[PDB]
Structure formats: C-alpha cells, structure tokens
Design an enzyme around this catalytic site. Structure first.
Site, PDB file in Angstrom:
ATOM      1  N   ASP A  36       2.702   6.540  -8.774  1.00 53.94           N
ATOM      2  CA  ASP A  36       3.318   5.795  -7.678  1.00 53.94           C
ATOM      3  C   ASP A  36       3.696   4.354  -8.017  1.00 53.94           C
ATOM      4  O   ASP A  36       2.825   3.467  -8.104  1.00 53.94           O
ATOM      5  CB  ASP A  36       2.354   5.828  -6.490  1.00 53.94           C
ATOM      6  CG  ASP A  36       2.895   5.114  -5.269  1.00 53.94           C
ATOM      7  OD1 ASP A  36       4.129   4.977  -5.126  1.00 53.94           O
ATOM      8  OD2 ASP A  36       2.078   4.711  -4.423  1.00 53.94           O
ATOM      9  N   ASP A 232      10.684   3.265  -6.018  1.00 51.71           N
ATOM     10  CA  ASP A 232       9.403   3.869  -5.652  1.00 51.71           C
ATOM     11  C   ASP A 232       9.260   5.381  -5.885  1.00 51.71           C
ATOM     12  O   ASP A 232       9.772   6.189  -5.118  1.00 51.71           O
ATOM     13  CB  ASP A 232       9.130   3.551  -4.177  1.00 51.71           C
ATOM     14  CG  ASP A 232       7.772   4.070  -3.705  1.00 51.71           C
ATOM     15  OD1 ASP A 232       7.003   4.570  -4.546  1.00 51.71           O
ATOM     16  OD2 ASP A 232       7.484   3.969  -2.491  1.00 51.71           O
TER      17      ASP A 232
END
EC number: 3.4.23.46
Length: 389
Positions: A36, A232
């Site tokens: 992440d 992201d």
C-alpha cells in the site's frame, strides 16, 4: 536492471489488493501483506478473525518487543486498532536481509480485512509524515534503508488479468512484481518518464491536463489536484475530485453514447454485462493524464484504456457474460491514481531522487487496436500553479 528473484513476487487483483509474502518474528511466521503506497504503517492481524487464515502470534516470537503503546487508524467505512511493537522482518522473495521494524499488531478491526483476499496485514510504503500515531513511528521502508544498503526506491508492476479470477486462480497465479531497491527492464516497454514527488507524505504528484480521447477536459488545472493527487496501490479506483469526476463522466458518456448504461453503472454501483467476448472496448475512450515533468515547462502523459478503467467482475449467474464495474469514482480528498491506473504501467517510486517514473507495463491489458501509453515531452507552462495549497 534484473532482479529476477523478486520478479513475480506478488499476488492479488485490483478490487482486493496486491500482496507480497513476508515473515515476522522468531522463528519466522509467514504472512501475506498488502502493498500500500497510500499509507505508512506496517500492520498485521494479530488475533483470530473470520477472514484471516493466519495471524501474528507475538507470544510465539522470541524477538518480539512491546512498545507499550496503542494505535488507531480510521477509514471511511472501516478501520483497525492495534498495539505497537517491533520484531524481525524478512521478505522471502525480496532482498536477502532481515530488519527490525515497527509492527502494529491489529487487535480489533471493522471492514478492514476482506473475505478471500488472502492478505493478513498491510505494508504502508508512504512517508512518516502520515504514519500513525505520529511521524515518530518509523515506516518499514525507512527502517529497511536505514539498516541495510538496499537502494532507496522500489518499483511496482501490478498485473490485472482483464477477466475475473476465482479464489483458486488468484492463489495460483502471479499478480505482478515489487522490485525492492531497483528497476527491472523486463517489466515494461518504451521509456520511463518521471514526475516530481511534490511533497513527501503521500506519494503526491501534479496533474496538469486531462484528455478524454484527445479532447481537453479544459478545466483550471488546480481542479485536477484539488486538495492533492497521489499514487495509491491500496486504492482500487481512479478517484477524481467532484468537479473533475462530473466533467470526465459527462465526456465518457458522450464518447460511448452509442450504448446507454443505467446511472448505477456510472456511479460504480452496478455492473454492465455483455455476451461472451463482445465487450465494445472501441466505443469507450482512452483517458490521458498529463504529469509535470522533471524539466522546466515540460510535461508527459500517461494514457489508459477502458481495459484499465472497467474492472472485471464475475457474473456468478450460470452465464458466460463478461461483466465489469466502472472503476472511476468521485473523491472529496483529491485525485487517487489507484490500482486501476497502476495496472497500466510499471511505476518507479524513486524516493532517492524524489520522483515517480511511469512506463508502459509489459503486462497491461489491451486489445489489438489500442495500447496504454506513456509519451512526452510536451511544452507546458505555469504547471506549479496546478498545485493546490
């Protein structure tokens, strides 16, 4: 230029996330960890949970250290709470090193773990600035670089399949590569183009122009980065600030008007299905995002296909239809170039030179007529003004 040991070390898919294998504690406890780039805490399930086949058992690790401090992380519709500590960590298909890193042992959570995703923790690769409880909790990559000589950058090739994958297939297939400390040329084609990391908290960048099938959306560029624009891997969709979203959707609907879809489709709520193999990719437009270049008054663009923004979803119904969800949605927190976008490119997070590189991914999904693209340069002025403050 060739770290084959790390090539193909990821598994997963856009809707559930892409994860890498890691070991924590002594003796090693193997766990699957979601990669992440939109967060900065290394956290793992540390107690039984219906969606966790395994979890971190601190009492069984002889090298576990208790920091005697709790941590809380809220989510739009979810979250997790944990207890901070440190332990020895390794990445089996990553560099051959072991580091002592901060670990948030997740004790309580809601809508965080996903059924069948197969990951049990999360690896926040962003900067300390956004770490919880505060920026004193050193992120994993920062500990890795501090304790070893691994070059300060990693690269990601997230590979979407372009069709639905059942639990078995995800488990048995390669979801991509996370090259830690380097760049592997077999993962892309063409040239790498870099855009500056505006500020080191999220991996923030600046978009200066947006086109739908070559047509300029023509909005004040500050709108494109209204609030911020980030890269992201922990977010599935391409998310756009409200005004941009409405303009983009209006233009995509107009480009695809030969076929009409219910409002719920455009709201990313319901799927659209076409009979086996007949998805009309050609009626959907390509989308180009122009990014500020490293050279003054220079920009480049990355172009994605509907094969990236239409996410495949199974049609459980006994039908052989090909179904998808529209994977562009609105955001009240700025632009998010999520997995949708990343599946189209090999993305280099060059922390060392404070820049992010983009190249066409050797595993992006496309058809015989169109391919994703990364092209430049374009002479663009006063881009700094596209930045929001």
């Amino acid at each position: 230029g060739s770290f084959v040991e790390m090539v193909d070390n990821l598994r997963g898919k856009s809707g559930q996330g892409y994860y890498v294998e890691m070991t924590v504690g002594s003796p090693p406890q193997t766990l699957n960890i979601l990669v992440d780039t939109g967060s900065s805490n290394f956290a793992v399930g540390a107690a039984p949970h219906p969606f966790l086949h395994r979890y971190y058992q601190r009492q069984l690790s002889s090298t576990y250290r208790d920091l005697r401090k709790g941590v809380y992380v809220p989510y739009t519709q979810g979250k997790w709470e944990g207890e901070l500590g440190t332990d020895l960590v390794s990445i089996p298909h990553g560099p051959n090193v072991t580091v002592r890193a901060n670990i948030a042992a997740i004790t309580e959570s809601d809508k965080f773990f996903i059924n069948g995703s197969n990951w049990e923790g999360i690896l926040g690769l962003a900067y300390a600035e956004i770490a919880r409880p505060d920026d004193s909790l050193e992120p994993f990559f920062d500990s890795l670089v501090k304790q070893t000589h691994v070059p300060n950058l990693f690269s990601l090739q997230l590979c979407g399949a372009g069709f639905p994958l059942n639990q078995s297939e995800v488990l048995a297939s390669v979801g991509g590569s996370m090259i830690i400390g380097g760049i592997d040329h077999s993962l892309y084609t063409g040239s790498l183009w870099y855009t500056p990391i505006r500020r080191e908290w999220y991996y923030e960048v600046i978009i200066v122009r947006v086109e739908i099938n070559g047509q300029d959306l023509k909005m004040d560029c500050k709108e494109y980065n209204y609030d911020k624009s980030i890269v992201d891997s922990g977010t599935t969709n391409l998310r756009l600030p409200k005004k941009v979203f409405e303009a983009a959707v209006k233009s995509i609907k107009a480009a695809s008007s030969t076929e009409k879809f219910p409002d719920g489709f455009w709201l990313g709520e319901q799927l659209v299905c076409w009979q086996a193999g007949t998805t009309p990719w050609n009626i959907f437009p390509v989308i180009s995002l122009y990014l500020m270049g490293e050279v003054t008054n220079q920009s480049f663009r990355i172009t994605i296909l509907p094969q990236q923004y239409l996410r495949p979803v199974e049609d459980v119904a006994t039908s052989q239809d090909d179904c998808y969800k529209f994977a562009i949605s609105q955001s009240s927190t700025g632009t998010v170039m999520g997995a949708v976008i990343m599946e189209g490119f090999y993305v280099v997070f060059d922390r060392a030179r404070k820049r992010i590189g983009f190249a066409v991914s050797a595993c992006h999904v496309h058809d015989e007529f169109r391919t994703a693209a990364v092209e430049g340069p374009f002479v663009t002025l006063d881009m700094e003004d596209c930045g929001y403050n």
